[PDB]
């Protein structure tokens, strides 16, 4: 029974990574657009320079 | 180039101090030493980036000149990712247990050898040297203040 | 011969206590300075009780209730919790050390 | 079964919560060299495979952090490898804590 | 024990199913990073020029 608790704890603990991943989709992907846009502007400015 | 000639003369004079390179040249591995001695605080990643991402074996089978070293220092000075000492003095406080402005030297040595870009045991010892005390602790504030003046 | 040694040596009993128990434990004050960088904007910028201060840090870290036990002077943890916080702590200050 | 699979595969060291388990290989293994000692230098327990050098480094780091003494105890029947374990621990301590 | 196993089955299936769709989200973030990396290469070579 304790083995299932350890497995349940690991399975339940994975929810934190999955729960955080859900918020990361709106933050990591959103922040990635700014980084990608900044890189596009940096390459354009570097090419112009 | 957006760089005055006054400081450029001193930079050329300092670069000409190496000499041990066959002639007015500079090795790839020794490029960081001359780039950090004149000024600025570039990182290993920044050095590898400005150098065009040299190969592992390219760091000992080629040499550059000053015409190519000047734009490197120019970009390192203009474009940089460093920070003031206010953030550094506040970063070392994470290791302070009692919170009395002191940290164990062994912890700092371990953090410098493992965490970050890693540093050889010969450099960390010289860095932590001089600040020895009775309790073996080194005040991070004084350490940062001394490193900033270097 | 190996089975007879593992029985008297207590290898089996020594592993269950670490899984079911809490081999990890840090003092309230020691747990703050060693893990405050993970959740800086969590505790009110000022004076606060050492016991109640750790409650705000654990709540901000989104840690399961079955992964820690708050006592009278130390904060227990399961076998493998501090290992995750240590890696996350170093990753946070990685930009500062470099 | 795990111990047998680790021994037959060339892995005598195996963790177990807070104490490591060792099995006498009865043969000079190549898991003892200056390169391996340098690799385990400053590495957490969960960063490298099981090895006496890892336990020694963990004990040294704990002693340097918590400022509390340590004791690398070795228990086992006659001819288990306690002497070799102590030898390797002393070698690692002399090569690292110099 | 049976309830935990039955409950863990739904969690494992949900976690596996959720993680499957999450792989596309992680790949999308990596794709945006790869697309943004192209600007870095253009900017890196631009600075070299
Ligand atoms: N980890 C090991 N690797 C290789 N050989 C070992 C190891 N441990 C023990 N031996 C071998 O076993 C033999 C007897 O060991 P012994 O000194 O009886 O160990 P202990 O003192 O722990 O009983 C030695 O000759 C040694 O070569």
Tell me how far CA of residue C72 lies from CA of B98, C22, C24, C35, C69, in angstroms. Answer: 20, 15, 15, 19, 10
Cβ atoms within 10 Å of C4's Cβ, excluding its own? 9
d(CA B21, CA D16): 56
d(CA C80, CA C67): 9
Which contiguous run of DSSP H or E holds residue A40? helix A2-48
Bridge partners, residue B26, by sequence: B64
- The verdict on the CB of residue D86 being under 6 Å from ligand 1 is no
Q: Is C10 on the interface with D (CB under 8 A)?
A: no
**Structure method:** cryo-EM
Q: What is the 3-state secondary structure (H, E, C) of D9-45?
A: CCCCCECCCCCCECCCCCCCCCCCCHHHHHHCCCCCC
Contact yes or no for D33/D92 (Cβ under 8 A): no
Q: How far is the CA of D78 from the centre of ligand 1 (A)?
A: 10
Residue D79 known to bind ligand: yes
What are φ and ψ of residue D8, in 5° steps? -65, -20
- The verdict on the CB of residue D20 being under 6 Å from ligand 1 is no
DSSP D32-81: -SHHHHHHTTT--TTTS-S-HHHHHHHHHHHHHHH----------STTSS
Sorted by sequence, the CB contacts under 8 Å of residue C54 that are 6+ apart come out as: C28, C31, C32, C70, C75
Q: What is the DSSP letter of B57?
A: G
Closest by Cα among C29, C86, C74, C18 to D62: C86
Interface test with D, best of C1, C4, C5, C31 (most D CBs within 10 A): C5
Sorted by sequence, the CB contacts under 8 Å of residue B100 that are 6+ apart come out as: none
Burial class (CB in 10 A: 0-12, 13-18, 19+), C52: exposed
Dihedral, CA atoms, B40, B123, B149, C34, nearest 10 degrees? 100
Tell me how far CA of residue A49 lies from CA of A37, B79, B81, C23, in angstroms. Answer: 18, 13, 20, 59
Bridge partners, residue C70, by sequence: C75
Closest by Cα among C48, D72, A35, D86 to E33: A35
- Considering all CA atoms of chain A, what is the largest pairwise distance in Å, rounded to the nearest integer? 67
Q: What is the DSSP letter of A4?
A: H
DSSP reduced 3-state for B51: coil
- The verdict on the CB of residue D23 being under 6 Å from ligand 1 is no
A9: nearest CB among C16, C62, C66? C66
Given an 8 Å threshold on Cβ–Cβ distance, is E29 in contact with A32?
yes
What's the number of CA atoms in the CB half-sphere (13 Å) around residue B63?
12
Given an 8 Å threshold on Cβ–Cβ distance, is E47 in contact with B75?
yes
Which contiguous run of DSSP H or E holds residue B138? strand B137-138
d(CA C34, CA D18): 22
Resolution value, angstrom units: 6.3
The nearest CA of chain E is from the CA of B53 a distance in Å of: 10
Bridge partners, residue C76, by sequence: C25, C69
Q: Count of residues for chain B?
A: 150
Contact yes or no for B17/B25 (Cβ under 8 A): no
- The verdict on the CB of residue D71 being under 6 Å from ligand 1 is no
d(CA C67, CA C63): 7
A46: nearest CB among E22, E33, E43? E43
d(CA D73, CA B101): 36
Q: Is D21 on the interface with C (CB under 8 A)?
A: yes
> Which of D21, D26, D92 has most ligand 1 atoms within 8 Å of its beta carbon, as the pocket-test mutant?
D26
Inter-chain contacts counted by CB atoms under 8 A, chains C and D: 24
Cβ atoms within 10 Å of D18's Cβ, excluding its own? 13
DSSP chain C: -HHHHHHHHTHHHHHHHHHHS--EEEEHHHHHHTTTTTSSTTS-SS---HHHHHHHHHHHTT--GGGEEE-SSEEEE-TTHHHHHHHHHHHHHHHHH-
- The verdict on the CB of residue D24 being under 6 Å from ligand 1 is yes
d(CA D11, CA B65): 53
- Tell me whether strands C24-27 and C74-77 are parallel, antiparallel or unpaired: antiparallel
Closest by Cα among C6, C4, C5, C19 to C79: C19
Residue D10 known to bind ligand: no
Burial class (CB in 10 A: 0-12, 13-18, 19+), C86: middle
Contact yes or no for C75/C28 (Cβ under 8 A): yes
Q: What is the DSSP letter of B26?
A: E
Cβ under 8 Å to B: D residues 30-49: 42-43
């Amino acid at each position: 029974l304790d083995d299932l608790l350890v497995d349940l704890d690991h399975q339940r603990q994975s929810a934190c990574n999955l729960e955080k991943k859900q918020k990361k989709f709106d933050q990591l992907l959103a922040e990635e657009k700014t980084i990608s846009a900044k890189y596009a502007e940096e390459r354009d400015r570097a090419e112009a320079e | 180039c957006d760089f005055s000639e006054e400081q450029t003369a001193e930079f050329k004079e300092a670069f000409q101090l190496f000499d041990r390179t066959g002639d007015g040249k500079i090795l790839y591995s020794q490029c960081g030493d001359v780039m950090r001695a004149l000024g600025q605080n570039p990182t290993n990643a920044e050095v590898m980036k400005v150098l065009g991402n040299p190969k592992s074996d390219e760091m000992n089978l080629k040499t550059l000149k000053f015409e190519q070293f000047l734009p490197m220092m120019q970009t390192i000075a203009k474009n940089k990712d460093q920070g003031c000492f206010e953030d550094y003095v506040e970063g070392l406080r994470v290791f302070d247990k009692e919170g009395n402005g002191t940290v164990m030297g062994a912890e700092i040595r371990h953090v410098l050898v493992t965490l970050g870009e890693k540093m050889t045991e010969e450099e960390v010892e010289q860095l932590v040297a001089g600040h020895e005390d009775s309790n073996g602790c080194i005040n991070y504030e004084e350490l940062v203040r001394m490193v900033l003046s270097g | 011969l190996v089975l007879d040694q593992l029985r008297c040596n207590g290898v089996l009993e020594g592993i269950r206590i670490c899984r079911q128990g809490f081999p990890n434990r840090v003092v309230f004050q020691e747990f703050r300075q060693r893990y405050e960088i993970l959740t800086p904007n969590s505790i009110p910028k000022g004076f606060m009780d050492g016991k109640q201060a750790c409650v705000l840090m654990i709540k901000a870290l989104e840690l399961d209730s079955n992964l820690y036990r708050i006592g009278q002077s130390k904060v227990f943890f399961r076998a493998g919790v501090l290992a995750h916080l240590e890696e996350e702590r170093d990753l946070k200050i990685t930009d500062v050390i470099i | 079964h795990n111990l047998k699979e680790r021994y037959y595969s060339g892995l005598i060291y195996t963790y177990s919560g807070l104490f490591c388990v060792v099995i006498n290989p009865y043969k000079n293994l190549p898991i003892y060299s200056e390169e391996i000692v340098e690799m385990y230098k400053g590495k957490k327990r969960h960063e490298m495979p099981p090895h006496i050098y890892a336990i020694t480094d963990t004990a040294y780091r704990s002693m340097m952090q918590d400022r509390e003494d340590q004791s690398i105890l070795c228990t086992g029947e006659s001819g288990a490898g306690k002497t070799e374990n102590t030898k390797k621990v002393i070698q690692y301590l002399a090569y690292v804590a110099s």
